Chains A and B, each alone.
Chain A
Amino acid sequence: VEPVVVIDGKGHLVGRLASVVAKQLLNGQKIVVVRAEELNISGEFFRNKLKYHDFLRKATAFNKTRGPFHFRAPSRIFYKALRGMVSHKTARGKAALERLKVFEGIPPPYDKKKRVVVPQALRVLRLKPGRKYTTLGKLSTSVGWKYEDVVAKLEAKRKVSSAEYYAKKRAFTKKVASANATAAESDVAKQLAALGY
């Protein structure tokens, strides 16, 4: 219902997130996905690494510059998974894909904005316990992505800043909850409690 929806992609399964995001884009919702290096794919790492190398094998034989373009970053693996769930050769699907932004880490503006989850796509809600899974940053590093260490450094910095934000936000909501508790047991607050409020 938001003008853009910011999905924190951590702990999400790539296909179950990509079909949901593909339907939101085609239904007209702008979606930005962050922390794409923290995405999950079900099945073991060697399993999914062999899958990527099987994908990496296929290219145009007379010119490898016009082949399937094997994009290596985790946001680009998510983008490739989400293409193919969109008619991207039509104008409508091109306009749908223009509604999507996928990033590794949480860069600016989005680091001071609310991030949501898609519980249809959450790994801890979908996979049976004991089932192995792959983290997309580790898989991307194995197949040639260069920037795992930079994203980890910037995410550690961003989390230090975000925790200093949240300490002040708890310090404020202490006072707000106590001041709402002082207004309780008054003739206005009992009147509001009579109406479910």
Chain B
Amino acid sequence: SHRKYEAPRHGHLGFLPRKRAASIRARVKAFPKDDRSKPVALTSFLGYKAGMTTIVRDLDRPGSKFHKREVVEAVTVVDTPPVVVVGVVGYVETPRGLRSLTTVWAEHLSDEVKRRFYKNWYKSKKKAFTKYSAKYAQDGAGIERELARIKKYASVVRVLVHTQIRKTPLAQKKAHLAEIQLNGGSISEKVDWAREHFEKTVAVDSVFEQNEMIDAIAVTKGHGFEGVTHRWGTKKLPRKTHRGLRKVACIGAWHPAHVMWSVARAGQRGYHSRTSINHKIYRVGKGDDEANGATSFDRTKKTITPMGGFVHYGEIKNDFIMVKGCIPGNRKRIVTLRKSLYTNTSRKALEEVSLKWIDTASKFGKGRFQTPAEKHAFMGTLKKDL
């Protein structure tokens, strides 16, 4: 007979299976639609999640009750050193889908990206791309034939970039290598842009602009095996229940004489690939810019880093992206920022954000001071040796 009372489903069946993602670097499964009138640009960028802070800004929302007043907003800071362009990849359209025709690599690759090709770098003779590097050596005619194949064929051009994870306060030293689509004009001109940018760096300023809605693609934080109560948000069973409370009581009817796929079960929670959309960029901060964290309204000489550093991350010495709100993944994680796949005209986009203040107190406690100068001015002088 029927359920006797209606309730909606627990959980979303479009995020199935709730398994561990295949890599720590989430895949960009769609790129923006190419307009061949625009100049050649990267559709995406790579960065690392440093952590969050909070801001104050005025609101430009006519009709809102909080129009032209201040609001406190959480912002996620993604540390974005410039990417190094090392390869190009050609893709032809086939009746079975998109197919990589060939890849052309740059002549010199750093040990950062070479270390990606090794499980055991410390024992290795480090032979990667040693015979490839001797195809540029005579005149590069074997490289120009492959680039001519990419120009002749290849309706889609993607570019290989890697992160500079040494510019980044992590103990990893092995770069993340990714394929970013080249949007813009003329497949030939895409190949020319990529060959010009071989061994070069693309900064996040020349890809992303302020007040841009972007998408974050990241693998979420892992939690291991989880019961159904937190994995799907089902109701807990009463206190009187024998054999445990943290369970789904009925896991099926007698017929179909099988547990159905829509029934909620214990399993892996987190470390899933997520693409979250429409996060607005609030600051594209330069790295060679003292006063990363100053605004036009504050002008206190301070960087984006909190006192004591970002917790578990470290300092930011690089360019960063201050994006509004929450994005998947935890701190230290590689995250791919992508352009918006559609043109949004929703009045929460197209709002020009001007920060009034960025919080830089310690996240390692309940911080009280924004700068050590403020701390010294409040507390006076202590016992600590001069």
The answer to whether B94 touches A150, judged by C-beta atoms less than 8 angstroms apart, is yes
Interface string of B255-295 (1 = CB under 8 A from A): 01011110000000000000000000000000000000000
Minimum CB distance partner of A153 in chain B: B93
A42-74 at interface with B (beta carbon < 8 Å) = 61-64
A100-119 at interface with B (beta carbon < 8 Å) = 103-105, 107
The answer to whether A105 touches B95, judged by C-beta atoms less than 8 angstroms apart, is yes
Minimum CB distance partner of B255 in chain A: A61
Residues from chain B with Cβ under 8 Å of A146 in the complex: 97
CB distance from A166 to the nearest CB of B (A): 24
B142-183 at interface with A (beta carbon < 8 Å) = none
Minimum CB distance partner of A61 in chain B: B256
Per the CB 8 Å criterion, the residue count for chain B at the interface is 10
CB distance from A28 to the nearest CB of B (A): 29
How distant is the Cα of A151 from the Cα of B260 in the complex, in angstroms?
Answer: 39
The answer to whether B259 touches A62, judged by C-beta atoms less than 8 angstroms apart, is yes
Residues from chain A with Cβ under 8 Å of B261 in the complex: 62-64
Residues from chain A with Cβ under 8 Å of B94 in the complex: 150
The answer to whether B258 touches A104, judged by C-beta atoms less than 8 angstroms apart, is no
How distant is the Cα of A94 from the Cα of B229 in the complex, in angstroms?
Answer: 47
The answer to whether A62 touches B260, judged by C-beta atoms less than 8 angstroms apart, is yes
B69-103 at interface with A (beta carbon < 8 Å) = 93-97
How distant is the Cα of A84 from the Cα of B96 in the complex, in angstroms?
Answer: 25
How distant is the Cα of A98 from the Cα of B256 in the complex, in angstroms?
Answer: 36
- Indicate whether A147 reaches chain B with its CB closer than 8 angstroms: yes
Interface string of B108-119 (1 = CB under 8 A from A): 000000000000
B202-227 at interface with A (beta carbon < 8 Å) = none
CB distance from A137 to the nearest CB of B (A): 11
CB distance from A73 to the nearest CB of B (A): 8
How distant is the Cα of A184 from the Cα of B261 in the complex, in angstroms?
Answer: 79
Residues from chain B with Cβ under 8 Å of A176 in the complex: none
The answer to whether A154 touches B260, judged by C-beta atoms less than 8 angstroms apart, is no
The answer to whether A62 touches B258, judged by C-beta atoms less than 8 angstroms apart, is yes
Minimum CB distance partner of B261 in chain A: A63
CB distance from B30 to the nearest CB of A (A): 13
How distant is the Cα of A24 from the Cα of B186 in the complex, in angstroms?
Answer: 49
How distant is the Cα of A154 from the Cα of B96 in the complex, in angstroms?
Answer: 12
Residues from chain A with Cβ under 8 Å of B96 in the complex: 147
CB distance from B252 to the nearest CB of A (A): 8
The answer to whether B259 touches A107, judged by C-beta atoms less than 8 angstroms apart, is no
CB distance from B96 to the nearest CB of A (A): 8
Partner of B95, one of A61, A63, A104: A104
Residues from chain B with Cβ under 8 Å of A150 in the complex: 93-95
Interface string of A122-153 (1 = CB under 8 A from B): 00000000000000000000000011001101
Minimum CB distance partner of B92 in chain A: A150
How distant is the Cα of A62 from the Cα of B95 in the complex, in angstroms?
Answer: 33
Residues from chain B with Cβ under 8 Å of A153 in the complex: 93
Minimum CB distance partner of A64 in chain B: B261
How distant is the Cα of A105 from the Cα of B96 in the complex, in angstroms?
Answer: 12
Minimum CB distance partner of A105 in chain B: B95
Minimum CB distance partner of A155 in chain B: B95
How distant is the Cα of A55 from the Cα of B161 in the complex, in angstroms?
Answer: 45
Residues from chain A with Cβ under 8 Å of B256 in the complex: 61-62
Residues from chain A with Cβ under 8 Å of B258 in the complex: 61-63
Residues from chain B with Cβ under 8 Å of A151 in the complex: 95
Residues from chain B with Cβ under 8 Å of A107 in the complex: 95
A5-25 at interface with B (beta carbon < 8 Å) = none
Minimum CB distance partner of A63 in chain B: B261
The answer to whether B93 touches A61, judged by C-beta atoms less than 8 angstroms apart, is no
Residues from chain B with Cβ under 8 Å of A61 in the complex: 256, 258, 260
CB distance from B223 to the nearest CB of A (A): 25
CB distance from A16 to the nearest CB of B (A): 25
Minimum CB distance partner of A65 in chain B: B261
The answer to whether B259 touches A154, judged by C-beta atoms less than 8 angstroms apart, is no
How distant is the Cα of A166 from the Cα of B381 in the complex, in angstroms?
Answer: 96
How distant is the Cα of A61 from the Cα of B255 in the complex, in angstroms?
Answer: 11
Minimum CB distance partner of B258 in chain A: A62
How distant is the Cα of A150 from the Cα of B94 in the complex, in angstroms?
Answer: 7
Residues from chain B with Cβ under 8 Å of A63 in the complex: 258, 260-261
Interface string of A74-104 (1 = CB under 8 A from B): 0000000000000000000000000000011
The answer to whether A147 touches B260, judged by C-beta atoms less than 8 angstroms apart, is no
A-B contact pairs, 22 of them (CB 8 A): A61-B258, A61-B260, A62-B256, A62-B258, A62-B259, A62-B260, A62-B261, A63-B258, A63-B260, A63-B261, A64-B261, A103-B95, A105-B95, A107-B95, A146-B97, A147-B96, A147-B97, A150-B93, A150-B94, A150-B95, A151-B95, A153-B93
Interface residues of B (CB under 8 A from A): 93-97, 256, 258-261
The 8 closest A-B pairs by CB, nearest first: A62-B258, A62-B260, A147-B95, A150-B93, A61-B256, A63-B261, A151-B95, A62-B256
Interface residues of A (CB under 8 A from B): 61-64, 103-105, 107, 146-147, 150-151, 153-154
* Further pairs besides A62-B261, A63-B260: 15, Cβ < 8 Å: A61-B256, A61-B258, A61-B260, A62-B256, A62-B258, A63-B258, A63-B261, A64-B261, A104-B95, A105-B95, A107-B95, A147-B95, A150-B95, A153-B93, A154-B95
